[PDB]
Amino acid sequence: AHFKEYQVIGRRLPTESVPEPKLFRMRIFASNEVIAKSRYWYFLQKLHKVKKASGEIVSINQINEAHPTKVKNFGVWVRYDSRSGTHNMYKEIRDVSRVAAVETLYQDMAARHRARFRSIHILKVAEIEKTADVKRQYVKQFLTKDLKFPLPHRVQKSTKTFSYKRPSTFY
Amino acid sequence: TDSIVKASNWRLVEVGRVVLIKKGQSAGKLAAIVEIIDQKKVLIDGPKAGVPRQAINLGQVVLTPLT
Amino acid sequence: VKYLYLRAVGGELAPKIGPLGLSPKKVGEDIAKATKEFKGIKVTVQLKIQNRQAAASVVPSASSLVITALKEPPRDRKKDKNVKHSGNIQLDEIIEIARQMRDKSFGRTLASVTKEILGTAQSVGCRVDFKNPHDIIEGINAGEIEIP
Amino acid sequence: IIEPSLKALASKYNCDKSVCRKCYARLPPRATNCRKRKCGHTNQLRPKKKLK
Amino acid sequence: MKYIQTEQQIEVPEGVTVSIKSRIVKVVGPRGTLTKNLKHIDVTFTKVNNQLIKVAVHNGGRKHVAALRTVKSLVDNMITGVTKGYKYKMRYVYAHFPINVNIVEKDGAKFIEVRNFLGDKKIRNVPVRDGVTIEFSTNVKDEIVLSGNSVEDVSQNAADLQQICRVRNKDIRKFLDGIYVSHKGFITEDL
Amino acid sequence: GIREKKAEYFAKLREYLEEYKSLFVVGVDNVSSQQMHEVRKELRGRAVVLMGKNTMVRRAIRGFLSDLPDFEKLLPFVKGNVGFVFTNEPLTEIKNVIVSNRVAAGLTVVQVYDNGQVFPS
RNA sequence: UCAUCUAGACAGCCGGACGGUGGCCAUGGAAGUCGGAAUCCGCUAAGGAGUGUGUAACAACUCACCGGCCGAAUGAACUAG
Ligand SMILES: [Zn+2]
């Protein structure tokens, strides 16, 4: 859906042999708290020997964007499962916030590789603080000095089923 | 004689271009394009008309001849 | 007037070259054999200068030949046609002498360089009691003066 | 005998070509893929067989 | 990958004048005039300083930016064809039967006729496209020269004359007979 | 690696400019490596010959521009195939040797820079 | 995933592409190019004890390397929609 980012902090259940476990923390892009906690336990079952019955979640907090009106370039490292194997990819997206960047990332992977939400693993997402570290041409195209371009062929959708003059596509 | 072309200029999108919000919650106010996200969407701001600073798809605004 | 150069194992085709110069093959061979005095045992470049009557034979200096000669070699019949792999002592003085003998002929870049090139020429020869030929040439500055 | 230069000029159009191994198409001599759809633009090409 | 702006340039010499309404190009020079419809290719033209014209495409795909350099080459070919002209020299190649080429007139249409190509009784006639002048050149044996403004018309007429002399049911690596284009250049080459 | 080799070139050039007051710019066309090698040997004692990519050289001179400002005048002359001769001998003797050697069917000295002064010669 | 890149990259033209040295065995010969091993120096801006054509062996031509013009990304191998 429209994604939100949460921090989820959890731990193992405390025993007498070891009280105070190590309080692992992860950042999850998810639609809501339930999906966020499910993905948290999914990745902790991939990492450490723990499961939901043997552990607990001590905190979940929404992390909204610090500057939601700054235009950033993000580099995203992703695992995905194809029909024959597992691959790593690095894609970079020029967008205004992290949740919108990963939303366009999920759309991009589903469009160009037919990869689903169950197949995509988000390794990391990070803002590229400096230009000329941008490595893709499709985003390096929009970083030029005095960028301007026209929008040819305007199509205006009509409300009536009949129009009384030939329309114009000037913009 | 001299060479003649038909120029055919139209309404470039760049910073400082004044746009009119076509549909949405503003829906009829003016804004100024602050920056260009990509080919299809831009970051605008309309601070006199009460339009909050936001990223918006270019299909939801109409570009005006004002710069 | 005409100079012809051939690589000849000593003690000895030649005739084909000789016919153009109208010189007897046997006479040329005898002259070459005498010149091979330098070594004969091994192949060496021989320069024949033709005066339009007779050809004079001299042995032009060659790095491989000089190096092979320097390595002490028991005379080989070559009927065996054995590999005859050449093993040699360091012979640092001989190589320096060889570099001096070259005397930067054909413009060797430096006196030290001429020696280094001479060392490289010993691809065939071991050229050292315990080392790869010219391996230590970069390491040691000794003998630079000797080559000059 | 034609002439040597004129044989060269005629052989430029008739003999200095390549042949697709799949669909026998006569192709440019420096080509990498066949221009035909029916072989699927394959890169199995051979030189056209000369005389002599 | 949707290149948002790609752009080529064409240089306009002192003698020519180029008129571009919507996508119809008219080039007028010393040797005459030429025109071209380009409403199928969807580019935009812009005169800079009366000797430079930029052609551009915005938000174009790979095929579209290929077509941009194609249309630049076409209009530049038109400009250099109305300035210098275009001249194709072709040579006659035969083994035994000499090829006898003349110019005839069925209903005033300037046909080029080809006789005795490999000794046949059939007479091959190729029509001549307008604007193309054909001269049977002296001082070089068996050479024909086609000149004009349009590279399309000149090279197509030369190609029709080449294709009309194809050999059937024989090994064509041995039967090399025909009429082949040997030189392509300008009428005022090395100007 | 590539940069390292390049860095060495920049350094040697700077040293050469400092070492010799007299600079000869020589243009080489159709000169064989063997032809070049012979010239180098003849002039080994009194002259230094340097060959390099022009793009590389121009940047170096601009980099070393603050010191040795007069060398800036040499930059217009650098265009085209060029070689640099650094020599103790003031002028004609070096020039005579370069032109004469290895003329076959051809080294030419395009310009001479000595002591901040440029001579067409 | 490797490499090259405004200190000038990849295409296209143009120039050089050298000495020790005909490196060592082996052959009637094989000198970079029938093979077996080694495969190193000098001069370098740069040039392999050779990429092919190439001759009985040469000679000759071309390469991969460096240079002028060009001024900005490109080459190889692989993966999957
Ligand atoms: Zn095919």
JSON list of C-alpha atoms and ligand atoms in Angstrom, two decimals, chain D residues 19-27 33-45, ligand 1:
[
{"chain": "D", "resi": 19, "resn": "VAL", "atom": "CA", "xyz": [25.75, -16.29, -45.71]},
{"chain": "D", "resi": 20, "resn": "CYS", "atom": "CA", "xyz": [23.50, -16.97, -42.73]},
{"chain": "D", "resi": 21, "resn": "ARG", "atom": "CA", "xyz": [23.82, -20.63, -41.75]},
{"chain": "D", "resi": 22, "resn": "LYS", "atom": "CA", "xyz": [20.15, -20.91, -40.77]},
{"chain": "D", "resi": 23, "resn": "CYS", "atom": "CA", "xyz": [18.24, -19.23, -43.60]},
{"chain": "D", "resi": 24, "resn": "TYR", "atom": "CA", "xyz": [20.89, -18.94, -46.39]},
{"chain": "D", "resi": 25, "resn": "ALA", "atom": "CA", "xyz": [20.47, -15.15, -46.63]},
{"chain": "D", "resi": 26, "resn": "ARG", "atom": "CA", "xyz": [23.11, -13.15, -48.48]},
{"chain": "D", "resi": 27, "resn": "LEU", "atom": "CA", "xyz": [24.47, -10.71, -45.93]},
{"chain": "D", "resi": 33, "resn": "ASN", "atom": "CA", "xyz": [23.56, -10.90, -37.12]},
{"chain": "D", "resi": 34, "resn": "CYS", "atom": "CA", "xyz": [21.24, -11.88, -39.93]},
{"chain": "D", "resi": 35, "resn": "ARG", "atom": "CA", "xyz": [18.74, -9.22, -40.95]},
{"chain": "D", "resi": 36, "resn": "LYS", "atom": "CA", "xyz": [15.95, -11.77, -41.44]},
{"chain": "D", "resi": 37, "resn": "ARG", "atom": "CA", "xyz": [13.17, -12.41, -38.94]},
{"chain": "D", "resi": 38, "resn": "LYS", "atom": "CA", "xyz": [12.63, -16.09, -39.76]},
{"chain": "D", "resi": 39, "resn": "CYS", "atom": "CA", "xyz": [16.00, -17.18, -38.36]},
{"chain": "D", "resi": 40, "resn": "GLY", "atom": "CA", "xyz": [15.57, -14.92, -35.34]},
{"chain": "D", "resi": 41, "resn": "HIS", "atom": "CA", "xyz": [18.47, -12.54, -36.18]},
{"chain": "D", "resi": 42, "resn": "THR", "atom": "CA", "xyz": [20.99, -15.28, -35.48]},
{"chain": "D", "resi": 43, "resn": "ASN", "atom": "CA", "xyz": [24.75, -14.79, -35.32]},
{"chain": "D", "resi": 44, "resn": "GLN", "atom": "CA", "xyz": [25.59, -18.09, -37.06]},
{"chain": "D", "resi": 45, "resn": "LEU", "atom": "CA", "xyz": [27.18, -16.69, -40.21]},
{"chain": "H", "resi": 1, "resn": "ZN", "atom": "ZN", "xyz": [19.32, -15.65, -41.28]}
]
